[PDB]
Amino acid sequence: PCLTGPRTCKDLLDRGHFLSGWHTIYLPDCRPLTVLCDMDTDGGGWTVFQRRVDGSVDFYRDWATYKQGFGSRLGEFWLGNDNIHALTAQGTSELRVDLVDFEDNYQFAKYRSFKVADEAEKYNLVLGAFVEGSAGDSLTFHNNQSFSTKDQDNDLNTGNCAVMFQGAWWYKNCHVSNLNGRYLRGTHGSFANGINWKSGKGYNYSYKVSEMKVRPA
Amino acid sequence: PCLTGPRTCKDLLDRGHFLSGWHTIYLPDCRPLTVLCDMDTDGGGWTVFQRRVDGSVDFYRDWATYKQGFGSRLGEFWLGNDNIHALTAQGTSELRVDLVDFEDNYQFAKYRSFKVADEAEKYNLVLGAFVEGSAGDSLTFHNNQSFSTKDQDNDLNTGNCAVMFQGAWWYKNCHVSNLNGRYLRGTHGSFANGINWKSGKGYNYSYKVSEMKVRPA
Amino acid sequence: PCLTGPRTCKDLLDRGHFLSGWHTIYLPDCRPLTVLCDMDTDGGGWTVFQRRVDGSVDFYRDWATYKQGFGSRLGEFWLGNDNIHALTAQGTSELRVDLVDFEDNYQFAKYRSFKVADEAEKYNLVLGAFVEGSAGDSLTFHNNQSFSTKDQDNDLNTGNCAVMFQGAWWYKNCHVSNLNGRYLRGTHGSFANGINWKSGKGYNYSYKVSEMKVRPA
Ligand SMILES: *[C@@H]1O[C@H](CO)[C@@H](O[C@@H]2O[C@H](CO)[C@@H](O[C@@H]3O[C@H](CO)[C@@H](O)[C@H](O)[C@@H]3O)[C@H](O)[C@H]2NC(C)=O)[C@H](O)[C@H]1NC(C)=O
Ligand SMILES: N[C@@H]1[C@@H](O)[C@H](O)[C@@H](COS(=O)(=O)O)O[C@@H]1O
Ligand SMILES: N[C@@H]1[C@@H](O)[C@H](O)[C@@H](COS(=O)(=O)O)O[C@@H]1O
Ligand SMILES: N[C@@H]1[C@@H](O)[C@H](O)[C@@H](COS(=O)(=O)O)O[C@@H]1O
Ligand SMILES: *[C@@H]1O[C@H](CO)[C@@H](O)[C@H](O)[C@H]1NC(C)=O
Ligand SMILES: [Ca+2]
Ligand SMILES: [Ca+2]
Ligand SMILES: [Ca+2]
Ligand SMILES: [Ca+2]
């Protein structure tokens, strides 16, 4: 069942599943996981690990909650740090970030490789080169940073980045992207605590849609 | 098939299903049923049997329709009275009611047990003690009453509550809650015919989101 | 699996699946396909093969992409010309087209039979009699015409209808319906390149919702 089953969303596309949606794959350790496949963007076959679309889910969550994953298949979610590690541990996944503003402008960024380490390495981000994208590069800054949540500060700032910027991320001191920030709906006077991508719409605009996704390259 | 399969949304959570969504459970008689699990609210592991979110579905329905269930897995639904009975017949399920107003403020009510009887007993409500909730108690009033729809009047009113308040419920003479009422979108001049919870926002305010859900005690 | 399994959304309804949403059916050759069932409209049991609702998906796509299907189970999609052929080849399906404008007026058209031929016959449209519908008949004009996309012109125009009208359809010279056109959101000055149904809201109005769906006649 593991040995016959699909291992990635790319396997599902290869087997004739052409519509984005939730499907079961088998992780390298043979555990089944139901994931969101994007078969429509940029050739299809992406496994989606983060999705924001309407502000229905609270993303200001603790370490245990980020570790296991949270949210809803009907809408917004974070798939979980243990899962994202399992998906990216071996071989090379590319990363794409898709963003939509409240005027329906679509922007994206793409990186050559993306891996997150295990819990003992604090889900350390190992990110390859910026390839291209109309949103510009707001992630290379975050290479080689631990993941941090409000109750576990692993950042390089003397304060608590997750609390200061009301999110959870691979904060440094502190960010140029904050896609797990608050769903603040376009322009906000609060500083850099929204769904922000600095090179895209800046530190005072919160996107309508965010998706982070991976595929074998 | 059934022997070791999950019996509730709580079993699924215990087995590592951390994302809300539609999953198959095996009812006490081993029939499979695809249900909506809420893995987030209040510890997670709730089986959701009513959901209102945008007024896309007509809830002013007849006895046969309430018996069978109606609506959409992608939006609003009533799971069905035969199914709700099968879910709650054996072994103490708690009830939670989650309500959201049009300014995104959340209120709730929780009850120590909840069951509905079979069709012959008119899906009679058997409700345990109010435990707590910021919405206040607007369901104890309905304890030990038959369900009624427009076309099957088992209420304690000389006329027809379901027609007068455009819903379906365990009406007495007539109600303090009406969550299968019309989707009237906030404050409404019309008396008590909306998605109303008397002790919450009162008889002239119709919530944006209603969910009714159960979990083993 | 196949000879006992459901063949259509109508079989699923007859077997007690009362909620709209995505389910597996078995095509005439026993291939499983996950499809969207509309268990409400006109008694229920329709298999939905096109859905537009918010302009999130690009429908200006090439022949290969129309052939396989594209979009998302979570929103807008085209189920795919090979699939639609398989669904409509044997046993005769009626067609219903559901349309909603931006003021929430609902209109429909219904045809007694609908089939599309295989790829070698360019997914030729074979349409039976108009039965009824408030949207009026804007599909008989397209009877017995090949499907065309921007990169494969099988139309009866000297130029390229798919390009001129920014869609994909059984174009003649060129159209009176264009439901795979651009999501232009109500009135538009551009001529006939939106989600248009001529006999409904005309060549300069793009509907909010369009669904195309089939059921055994
Ligand atoms: C990820 O970040 C860690 C810092 O947390 C980087 O570790 C540091 O790596 C540098 C080299 O890039 C180390 O410098 C070397 O130190 C010794 C002297 O102690 C010296 O012989 C060399 O001249 C060089 O300066 C640094 O010590 C090390 N720091 C720690 C605390 O381990 C790591 O390299 C970064 N990883 C990547 C892939 O960039
Ligand atoms: N097949 C059902 C019938 O069983 C039902 O009695 C009728 C009216 O239902 S109501 O909920 O709309 O009143 O509609 C549906 O077509
Ligand atoms: N893998 C597909 C190709 O097979 C397709 O021909 C091409 C253009 O598609 S279009 O619908 O966007 O024109 O992109 C897609 O990535
Ligand atoms: N132009 C079509 C014919 O081709 C068809 O034979 C007839 C009956 O079709 S029916 O599917 O609607 O029974 O209708 C219309 O006249
Ligand atoms: C419930 O109601 C009926 C009257 O409608 C009564 O005969 C019965 O004893 C009641 N049981 C309880 C616990 O109230
Ligand atoms: Ca810090
Ligand atoms: Ca009656
Ligand atoms: Ca009465
Ligand atoms: Ca031509």
UniProtKB/Swiss-Prot annotation, chains A, B, C:
It is found in: Secreted. Residues 1-217 form the Fibrinogen C-terminal domain. Its main location: secreted. One of its GO terms (molecular function) is calcium-dependent protein binding. This is Ficolin-2. GO terms for biological process: cell surface pattern recognition receptor signaling pathway; complement activation, lectin pathway; defense response to Gram-negative bacterium; defense response to Gram-positive bacterium; opsonization; positive regulation of opsonization; proteolysis; recognition of apoptotic cell. Ca(2+) binds at residues 153, 155, 157, 159. The fibrinogen-like domain (FBG) contains calcium-binding sites that may be involved in carbohydrate binding. May function in innate immunity through activation of the lectin complement pathway. Calcium-dependent and GlcNAc-binding lectin. Enhances phagocytosis of S.typhimurium by neutrophils, suggesting an opsonic effect via the collagen region. Belongs to the ficolin lectin family. The gene is FCN2. Expressed by the liver and secreted in plasma. GO terms for cellular component: blood microparticle; collagen trimer; collagen-containing extracellular matrix; external side of plasma membrane; extracellular exosome; extracellular region; extracellular space; serine-type endopeptidase complex. Glycans are attached at residues 144, 204. Disulfide bonds join 2-30, 9-37, 161-174. Homotrimer. Interacts with elastin. Interacts with MASP1 and MASP2. Interacts with CR1. A carbohydrate binds at residues 145-146. Keywords: Calcium, Collagen, Complement activation lectin pathway, Disulfide bond, Glycoprotein, Hydroxylation, Immunity, Innate immunity, Lectin, Metal-binding, Repeat, Secreted, Signal. Coiled coil: none annotated.
